[PDB]
Structure formats: C-alpha cells, structure tokens
UniProtKB/Swiss-Prot annotation:
Coiled coil: none annotated. This is Transforming growth factor alpha. The lineage of its organism: Eukaryota, Metazoa, Chordata, Craniata, Vertebrata. Residues 1-50 are extracellular. Disulfide bonds join 8-21, 16-32, 34-43. It is found in: Secreted, Extracellular space. Residues 4-44 form the EGF-like domain. The chain holds residues 40 to 89 of 160 of the full protein. It comes from the Eukaryota.
Amino acid sequence: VVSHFNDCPDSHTQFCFHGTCRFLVQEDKPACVCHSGYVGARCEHADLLA
C-alpha cells in the first residue's frame, strides 16, 4: 500500500551509523542511505563542514 519496500528488517535495523537503510524486498538486499553531511564507508565520520 505504501510502495514496495518495507523500511528495513528487524535484524539489520542498523546497516550504517549515520544513514537510513532500505531493503529490496523484491530481491532481498539491504542497503544504506547516507544523508548529505556524513562521510565514511559506514558514514561513521562527518563532513567537517558540508
């Protein structure tokens, strides 16, 4: 009813420090969504300025 991806599973609730997470339920595949401002493989760091 909302779309085709139910936010994220209950186990991988944390796939990235600073960055949302989506889940292709059509092909089961968790991913990360970093917001403009964070940096690092796991967005663990922060863009000093922007």
